[PDB]
Design an enzyme around this catalytic site. Structure first.
Site, PDB file in Angstrom:
ATOM      1  N   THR A 266      41.243  37.988  29.301  1.00  0.00           N
ATOM      2  CA  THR A 266      42.299  37.782  30.246  1.00  0.00           C
ATOM      3  C   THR A 266      43.226  36.679  29.806  1.00  0.00           C
ATOM      4  OG1 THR A 266      40.774  36.446  31.566  1.00  0.00           O
ATOM      5  CG2 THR A 266      41.196  38.712  32.279  1.00  0.00           C
ATOM      6  N   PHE A 391      43.194  33.797  39.936  1.00  0.00           N
ATOM      7  CA  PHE A 391      41.850  33.295  39.554  1.00  0.00           C
ATOM      8  C   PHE A 391      40.842  33.523  40.689  1.00  0.00           C
ATOM      9  CE2 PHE A 391      44.803  30.894  36.863  1.00  0.00           C
ATOM     10  CZ  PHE A 391      44.319  31.264  35.642  1.00  0.00           C
ATOM     11  N   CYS A 398      37.468  31.794  39.662  1.00  0.00           N
ATOM     12  CA  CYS A 398      37.297  31.648  38.220  1.00  0.00           C
ATOM     13  C   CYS A 398      36.726  30.256  37.867  1.00  0.00           C
ATOM     14  CB  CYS A 398      38.655  31.816  37.490  1.00  0.00           C
ATOM     15  SG  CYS A 398      38.434  31.808  35.730  1.00  0.00           S
TER      16      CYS A 398
HETATM   17  C1  HEM Z   1      44.021  33.859  32.658  1.00  0.00           C
HETATM   18  C2  HEM Z   1      42.717  33.915  32.356  1.00  0.00           C
HETATM   19  C3  HEM Z   1      41.764  34.277  33.487  1.00  0.00           C
HETATM   20  C4  HEM Z   1      41.934  35.085  34.554  1.00  0.00           C
HETATM   21  C5  HEM Z   1      43.250  35.700  35.011  1.00  0.00           C
HETATM   22  C6  HEM Z   1      40.650  35.141  35.223  1.00  0.00           C
HETATM   23  C7  HEM Z   1      40.366  35.750  36.430  1.00  0.00           C
HETATM   24  C8  HEM Z   1      39.193  35.703  37.161  1.00  0.00           C
HETATM   25  C9  HEM Z   1      39.014  36.293  38.492  1.00  0.00           C
HETATM   26  C10 HEM Z   1      40.127  37.061  39.215  1.00  0.00           C
HETATM   27  C11 HEM Z   1      37.771  36.050  38.882  1.00  0.00           C
HETATM   28  C12 HEM Z   1      37.091  36.382  40.212  1.00  0.00           C
HETATM   29  C13 HEM Z   1      36.472  37.766  40.035  1.00  0.00           C
HETATM   30  C14 HEM Z   1      35.950  38.369  41.337  1.00  0.00           C
HETATM   31  O1  HEM Z   1      36.256  37.822  42.434  1.00  0.00           O
HETATM   32  O2  HEM Z   1      35.298  39.485  41.190  1.00  0.00           O
HETATM   33  C15 HEM Z   1      37.137  35.321  37.812  1.00  0.00           C
HETATM   34  C16 HEM Z   1      35.867  34.867  37.774  1.00  0.00           C
HETATM   35  C17 HEM Z   1      35.258  34.335  36.653  1.00  0.00           C
HETATM   36  N1  HEM Z   1      35.818  33.876  35.502  1.00  0.00           N
HETATM   37 FE1  HEM Z   1      37.814  33.970  35.059  1.00  0.00          FE
HETATM   38  N2  HEM Z   1      39.746  34.363  34.519  1.00  0.00           N
HETATM   39  C18 HEM Z   1      40.390  33.903  33.386  1.00  0.00           C
HETATM   40  C19 HEM Z   1      39.815  33.107  32.399  1.00  0.00           C
HETATM   41  C20 HEM Z   1      38.453  32.805  32.283  1.00  0.00           C
HETATM   42  C21 HEM Z   1      37.820  31.951  31.278  1.00  0.00           C
HETATM   43  C22 HEM Z   1      38.545  31.329  30.089  1.00  0.00           C
HETATM   44  C23 HEM Z   1      36.521  31.925  31.541  1.00  0.00           C
HETATM   45  C24 HEM Z   1      35.450  31.222  30.774  1.00  0.00           C
HETATM   46  C25 HEM Z   1      35.654  30.082  30.077  1.00  0.00           C
HETATM   47  C26 HEM Z   1      36.298  32.757  32.726  1.00  0.00           C
HETATM   48  C27 HEM Z   1      35.111  32.959  33.354  1.00  0.00           C
HETATM   49  C28 HEM Z   1      34.874  33.494  34.609  1.00  0.00           C
HETATM   50  C29 HEM Z   1      33.603  33.489  35.240  1.00  0.00           C
HETATM   51  C30 HEM Z   1      32.239  33.181  34.578  1.00  0.00           C
HETATM   52  C31 HEM Z   1      33.846  34.109  36.591  1.00  0.00           C
HETATM   53  C32 HEM Z   1      32.810  34.391  37.701  1.00  0.00           C
HETATM   54  C33 HEM Z   1      32.669  32.999  38.434  1.00  0.00           C
HETATM   55  C34 HEM Z   1      31.610  33.067  39.550  1.00  0.00           C
HETATM   56  O3  HEM Z   1      31.630  34.045  40.381  1.00  0.00           O
HETATM   57  O4  HEM Z   1      30.712  32.195  39.588  1.00  0.00           O
HETATM   58  N3  HEM Z   1      37.537  33.126  33.208  1.00  0.00           N
HETATM   59  N4  HEM Z   1      38.009  35.133  36.802  1.00  0.00           N
HETATM   60  C1  1C6 Z   2      39.727  51.128  40.993  1.00  0.00           C
HETATM   61  O1  1C6 Z   2      38.847  50.030  40.603  1.00  0.00           O
HETATM   62  C2  1C6 Z   2      39.260  48.971  39.773  1.00  0.00           C
HETATM   63  C3  1C6 Z   2      40.233  49.235  38.838  1.00  0.00           C
HETATM   64  C4  1C6 Z   2      40.673  48.233  37.986  1.00  0.00           C
HETATM   65  C5  1C6 Z   2      40.143  46.965  38.016  1.00  0.00           C
HETATM   66  N1  1C6 Z   2      40.398  45.821  37.292  1.00  0.00           N
HETATM   67  C6  1C6 Z   2      39.611  44.883  37.794  1.00  0.00           C
HETATM   68  S1  1C6 Z   2      39.645  43.305  37.143  1.00  0.00           S
HETATM   69  C7  1C6 Z   2      37.964  43.068  36.917  1.00  0.00           C
HETATM   70  C8  1C6 Z   2      37.713  41.835  36.071  1.00  0.00           C
HETATM   71  N2  1C6 Z   2      38.123  40.648  36.592  1.00  0.00           N
HETATM   72  C9  1C6 Z   2      38.012  39.444  35.968  1.00  0.00           C
HETATM   73  C10 1C6 Z   2      37.396  39.313  34.708  1.00  0.00           C
HETATM   74  C11 1C6 Z   2      37.248  37.941  34.049  1.00  0.00           C
HETATM   75  C12 1C6 Z   2      36.865  40.526  34.035  1.00  0.00           C
HETATM   76  O2  1C6 Z   2      36.261  40.352  32.811  1.00  0.00           O
HETATM   77  C13 1C6 Z   2      36.535  41.285  31.746  1.00  0.00           C
HETATM   78  C14 1C6 Z   2      37.020  41.844  34.742  1.00  0.00           C
HETATM   79  C15 1C6 Z   2      36.496  43.131  34.148  1.00  0.00           C
HETATM   80  N3  1C6 Z   2      38.800  45.345  38.794  1.00  0.00           N
HETATM   81  C16 1C6 Z   2      39.103  46.652  39.015  1.00  0.00           C
HETATM   82  C17 1C6 Z   2      38.683  47.696  39.868  1.00  0.00           C
END
Ligand code: HEM
Ligand code: 1C6
Ligand code: FAD
Ligand code: FMN
Ligand code: 1C6
Lengths: 460, 229, 402, 58, 57
Positions: A266, A391, A398
């Protein structure tokens, strides 16, 4: 109120709407058509897609909703396990890993990753300095080289050496294949049709390639005379202050794969979209380039200098506003509840937050939501709660947010200091979906500023 | 050719140690020209020397340092846990928890570091019970409690800048304070690590002299100076 | 060519190097005190506005540098080189050779002694009763009462303890980095964009520590400069705006006794140019206070001329005129309460400049009390009124403890 | 320009992980081809950005 | 070292103060073994050079 629903296909309900290579973009078009909320049904399954800050602020109330594993995330747990990303909030391994690994993203930790980020960023600037005249740059390909190497090195003291490779690294090839398959699975009416026997086989082999690399990182470290005071050190050594327990071996392996993927894909996307928007907005490019020159006075950037790059920061947040690279997250109703005074939910009902649509809510952002204007972010305080969520939300937000932003800001700052860019093909945005989002086929040319070198002497 | 070879081999020899790890048997490939085929080595970097961040830290062992946070987005919570990490290095017996979970249960021994943000002039979700308890409730006096307060704020919030840390700090004192170290502020809109750094160093010493300071973390700064020529 | 030690501190503040174009005394012959007026040239890249401050990076004076080289038995010119490995807010040229005297221009020599400093000295002391005394000073009460209250320095303790075996290079490294001093620019850029003036009260007295005569570092540095000398400074704009209203008919009340007049001299010069450009000016009351017109009535001629040209109405208070009551600006303000409060009811801006520890609070209390008396309201209503005035941007302070 | 390519070779090796090895004549060809390309012709074969030999070498 | 008389003759001829700090630069080699790209007073620069060799062409 009864909620809108897109077109249906008899007994498949809405499932065939996901039979497309770009399902988030399709959902976005449905949102524009139907508005702030719609129901999406498949055989045996329902979810509700939210697009307005008005509803999403309520979805973000952690006393009423918790993180859900969407179908997408349930398929990715097949390799992410009960790592931080695909663990339920109530699974013991979630809070334990959260508590053990949060200290790896403290300010001191961030300061200590800086030098290694610079190492990889210097490798990217050098590759581009060393291209011949009229050669071009495959942007998302090079951004992936940089982001994968950066998490490999900063997180694990492991060198993927992606800039020494002409094709993508094997780990990236299997990652992309695995994400593609998870995405394609979303539309499958009969996932156990034996027609998908080969799909499953390729899936396991890709899971294997990724796990073989995990095994190597672990082996290196066991060899690593290791202080390597990094994320892996904390995985193998930290204790959760609550339970008093460290992570066991199985969970650590899931954490490593989780951080290798979430830790780069990402961020690669964000840098790619940010370069895209800069070349398409030459006045914004110049204003960002001006800041880079002004701020980054030394041969390599310092930590405090990266923190000085305000406008570059603004550029990145604006790229995340239009094209948040993890474009959806999912929530479930902890108890029966009413959304927006009009949409009753039962306990367990699922919601999807469609982040790019949230980011286009004209009630929040004004009418010009399709324009790229980093100035929107000049005072981030001004933005209402739950209006800008690239995030995610709350305790499940995140973990790596500061790491991604520091890296992106450092890298984009260096690119802008060191080169002039040309959109030589007049590139038409084409957004590839692998659950995550990234420009496909985006190319530019970069003319070195020799930060000036052209020299005299005489051939007189 | 010779200038290039000499330059390159010179650099290789400066920068690495080499190992013939396979005990390679010379096999000379002919393409009119000659070259070893299959020749492999390993190269161990001399970091021309770099190994170099590890603390002889043994942590948290051993006056009682309780660190409480008020946080919604984790800035204050990470700062709190960072403090508890440096305390462990300074031999304390630190404990980390939210603010409104020790509401009334302030430590009558050691010291309590209080790290908190503000939201539009209000306490974070995990600090509201604490402050309310602090505001109205004053009966259960805060005598014995030797504390210090660190503020996480943003100058972008005009009239409310650091209002909650300030409230807690001064309220704690108009109830019987053992304020061992003056409050500290962080402006996210500028140099939050500068101020956090200033408050911290001054802080350890205030509590040092006051008592503390001895369960790890060389009393010696073990910091050198230069004074060369 | 021509380059001066680039100072980190000078780089941190964007201080540029530049020339003094004038330097003169403002008090009368035979005043026991001194207040200086300096005019400074600014380079093309710098610019300023009324109510901006000049940041001055000062030098330590000869007397205090000699006290250090004498204590360590060193020659000023002795070249030496430091080193540590450890970080250093003390912003010292490390791994360079540099004389003692120039090293001594990087550090504060008269800050109160710190607890780290005291421990370092105790550890090098081979005078047992002298070690007991230095350690006594570490206790909470003694430290407040004998160190902080009297501003007792490391230097004064090294002079008191000649058999403390601390050495120069450890001394220098334990000291804080030299800080800039701020001065309220006393001129308007509407008269000359590239020239700025400051108005500097000279700190001098018997040291509260008991060790001889005290001189304030920047103020005595500034007092000794002359036409053609160079000076390292930068422009600083305060977070709290301190500027004239946008409309020159909006009424002003200014209170600025002593060196507090400084920024109001800029206001006066601005209004004077606006008039010369045909703009009409409203009422502007300047409350100025000093000991005596025979002593410290700074810029008297200019302020009396301004008043003659209708740029201001001038109200003076004198503390030490023979056969008169001791008068301060707040006493005069209180006589004028009715008028001053009507003005604030018609949209006047109110400004205070000068001493923030005693004068400002007393002026504030008198303003609120005038309100209370005129509008027959409580002290709480008068306090809320002032709070609202400040929130409208109409009650501004440029005050200092220094 | 020779230094440019030589620094690229030293960096590749600095950046290998523990227990990875070096294919010697392969890396020496990356360096020598790039060195004549750059010094002789201001042309960058970018051989250190390739995992296989450059097509010209094949 | 060059004596005071002869150093003063130079600073007088150029209208310079002994203590005036300055910084040189060329790009070209220099048997004249001068601290280049460093700030250094005039008087100390003048201790690096011969002041009374015959004038060269
Ligand atoms: C622009 C870059 C990034 C974007 C847009 C992004 C986005 C996100 C989002 C949307 C979630 C929440 C997912 C959910 O609610 O299902 C998430 C969780 C997470 N991200 Fe990122 N992320 C980025 C970079 C990174 C980086 C650099 C790391 C590691 C160094 C990382 C590690 C994780 C982890 C481990 C989670 C799960 C956290 C938890 O639930 O405890 N992300 N991220
Ligand atoms: C229709 O169902 C969908 C479709 C696209 C989707 N894209 C997403 S975004 C899901 C996502 N978010 C954050 C991280 C860091 C990540 O790690 C590779 C992933 C797979 N969820 C979806 C669910
Ligand atoms: C925003 C602002 C604007 C200002 N504008 C002006 C201005 O326009 N004009 C002006 O003159 N000043 C102004 N000041 C104050 C000014 O910056 C300097 O602080 C002042 O000149 C004293 O600094 P100094 O280095 O000469 O003395 P320092 O060496 O810093 O010593 C100052 C300290 O010494 C203390 N002290 C005084 N007497 C003794 C004594 N006898 N024994 C021991 N300690 C003593 C003082 O209380 C103070 O704590 C302003 C300050 C601020 C913050
Ligand atoms: C909605 C909102 C309101 C805020 N209000 C204030 C405030 O009133 N006073 C302040 O000093 N900072 C304010 N801040 C800045 C935050 O306190 C600053 O980001 C703090 O570092 C966040 O800490 P945390 O992540 O632990 O919750 C506010 C921030 C937000 C997002
Ligand atoms: C039996 O005939 C033979 C066999 C081998 C051979 N090897 C050679 S060495 C020939 C040679 N020399 C120098 C250079 C620079 C060169 O460039 C690639 C070549 C091909 N001559 C031969 C003749």
């Amino acid at each position: 109120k009864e909620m809108p629903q897109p077109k249906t296909f008899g007994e498949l309900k809405n499932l065939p709407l996901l039979n497309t290579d770009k399902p988030v973009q399709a959902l976005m078009k449905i949102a524009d058509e139907l508005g702030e909320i719609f129901k999406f049904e498949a055989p045996g399954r329902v979810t509700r897609y939210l697009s307005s800050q008005r509803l999403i602020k309520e979805a973000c109330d952690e006393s009423r909703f918790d993180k859900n594993l969407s179908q997408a995330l349930k398929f990715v747990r097949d390799f992410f396990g009960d790592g931080l990303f695909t663990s339920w909030t109530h699974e013991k391994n979630w809070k334990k890993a959260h508590n053990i690994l949060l200290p790896s993203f403290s300010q001191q930790a961030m300061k200590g990753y800086h030098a290694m980020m610079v190492d990889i960023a210097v490798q990217l600037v050098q590759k581009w300095e060393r291209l011949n005249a009229d050669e071009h740059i495959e942007v998302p390909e090079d951004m992936t080289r940089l982001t994968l190497d950066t998490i490999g090195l900063c997180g694990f003291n492991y060198r993927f050496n992606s800039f020494y490779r002409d094709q993508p690294h094997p780990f990236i090839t299997s990652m992309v294949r695995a994400l593609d398959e998870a995405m394609n699975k979303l539309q499958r009416a009969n996932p156990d049709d034996p027609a998908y026997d080969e799909n499953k086989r390729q899936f396991q082999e890709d899971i294997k390639v990724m796990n073989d690399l995990v095994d190597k990182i672990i082996a290196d470290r066991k060899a690593s005379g290791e202080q390597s005071d990094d994320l892996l050190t904390h995985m193998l050594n930290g204790k959760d202050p609550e339970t008093g327990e460290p992570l066991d071996d199985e969970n650590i392996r899931y954490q490593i794969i989780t951080f290798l993927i979430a830790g780069h894909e990402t961020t690669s996307g964000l840098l790619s979209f940010a370069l895209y928007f800069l070349v398409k907005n030459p006045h914004v490019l110049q204003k960002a380039a001006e800041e880079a020159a002004r701020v980054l006075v030394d041969p390599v950037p310092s930590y405090k200098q990266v923190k000085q790059l305000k406008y570059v920061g603004m550029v990145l947040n604006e790229a995340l506003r239009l094209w948040p690279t993890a474009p959806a997250f999912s929530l479930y109703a902890k108890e029966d509840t009413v959304l927006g005074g009009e949409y009753p939910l039962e306990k367990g009902d699922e919601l999807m937050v469609l982040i790019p649509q949230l980011h286009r809510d004209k009630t929040i952002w004004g009418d010009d939501v399709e324009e790229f204007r980093p100035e929107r972010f000049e005072n981030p305080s001004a933005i209402p709660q739950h209006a800008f969520k690239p995030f995610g939300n709350g305790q499940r937000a995140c973990i790596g947010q500061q790491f991604a932003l520091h890296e992106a800001t450092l890298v984009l700052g260096m690119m802008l200091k060191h080169f002039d860019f040309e959109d030589h093909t007049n590139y038409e945005l084409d957004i590839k979906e692998t659950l995550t989002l990234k420009p496909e086929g985006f190319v530019v040319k970069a003319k070195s500023k020799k930060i000036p070198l052209k020299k005299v002497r005489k051939k007189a | 050719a010779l200038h290039e070879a000499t330059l390159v081999l010179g650099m290789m020899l400066k920068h690495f140690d080499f190992e013939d790890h396979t005990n390679y048997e010379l096999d000379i490939k002919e393409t009119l020209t000659l070259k070893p085929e299959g020749f492999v080595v390993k190269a161990k970097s001399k970091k021309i020397p770099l190994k170099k961040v590890r603390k002889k830290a043994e942590n948290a062992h051993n006056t009682p340092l309780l660190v409480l946070y008020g946080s919604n987005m984790g800035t204050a919570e990470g700062t709190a846990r960072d403090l508890a990490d440096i305390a462990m290095s300074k031999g304390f017996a630190p404990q980390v928890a939210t603010l409104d979970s020790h509401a009334g249960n302030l430590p009558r021994e050691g010291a309590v570091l209080i790290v908190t943000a503000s939201y539009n002039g209000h306490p974070p979700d995990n600090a509201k019970q604490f402050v309310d308890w602090l505001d109205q409730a004053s009966a259960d006096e805060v005598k014995g409690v030797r504390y210090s307060v660190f503020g996480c704020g943003d100058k972008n919030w005009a009239t409310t800048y650091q209002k909650v840390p300030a409230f807690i700090d001064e309220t704690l004192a108009a109830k019987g304070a053992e304020n061992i170290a003056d409050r500290g502020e962080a402006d996210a809109s500028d140099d939050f690590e500068g101020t956090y750094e200033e408050w911290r160093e001054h802080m350890w010493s205030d509590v040092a002299a006051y008592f503390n300071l001895d369960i790890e973390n060389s009393e010696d700064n073990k910091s050198t100076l230069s004074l060369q020529f | 060519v021509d380059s001066a030690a680039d100072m980190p501190l000078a780089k941190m503040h964007g201080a540029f190097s530049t020339n003094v174009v004038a330097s003169k005394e403002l008090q009368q012959p035979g005043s026991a005190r001194s207040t200086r007026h300096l005019e400074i040239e600014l380079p093309k890249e710098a610019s300023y506005q009324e109510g901006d401050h000049l940041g001055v990076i000062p030098r330590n004076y000869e007397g205090i540098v000699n006290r250090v080289t004498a204590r360590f038995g060193l020659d000023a010119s002795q070249q030496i080189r430091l080193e540590a490995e450890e970080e250093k807010l003390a912003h010292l040229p490390l791994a360079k050779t540099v004389s003692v005297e120039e090293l001594l221009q990087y550090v504060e020599l008269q800050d109160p002694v710190t607890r780290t400093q005291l421990r370092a000295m105790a550890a090098k002391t081979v005078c047992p009763p002298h070690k007991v005394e230095l350690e006594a000073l570490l206790e909470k009460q003694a430290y407040k009462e004998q160190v902080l209250a009297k501003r007792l320095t490391m230097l004064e303790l090294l002079e008191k303890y000649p058999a403390c075996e601390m050495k120069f290079s450890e001394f220098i490294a334990l000291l804080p980095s030299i800080r800039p001093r701020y001065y309220s620019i006393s001129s308007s850029p509407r008269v000359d964009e590239k020239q700025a003036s400051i108005t500097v009260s000279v700190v001098s007295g018997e040291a509260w520590s008991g060790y001889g005569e005290y001189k304030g570092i920047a103020s005595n540095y500034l007092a000794e400069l002359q036409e053609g000398d160079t000076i390292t400074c930068f422009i600083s704009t305060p977070q709290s705006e301190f500027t004239l209203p946008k409309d020159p008919e909006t009424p002003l009340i200014m209170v600025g006794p002593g060196t507090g007049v400084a920024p109001f001299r800029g206001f006066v010069q601005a209004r004077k140019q606006l008039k010369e450009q045909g703009q009409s000016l409203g009422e502007a009351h300047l409350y100025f206070g000093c000991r005596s017109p025979h002593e410290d009535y700074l810029y008297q001629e200019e302020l009396e001329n301004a008043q003659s040209e209708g740029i201001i109405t001038l109200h003076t208070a004198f503390s030490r005129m023979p056969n008169q009551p001791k008068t301060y600006v707040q006493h005069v303000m209180e006589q004028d309460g009715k008028k001053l409060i009507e003005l604030l009811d018609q949209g006047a801006h109110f400004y205070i400049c000068g001493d923030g520890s005693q004068m400002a609070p007393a002026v504030e209390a008198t303003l609120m009390k005038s309100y209370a008396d005129v509008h027959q309201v409580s002290e709480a209503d008068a306090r809320l009124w002032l709070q609202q005035l400040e929130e409208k941007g109409r009650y501004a302070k440029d005050v200092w403890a220094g």
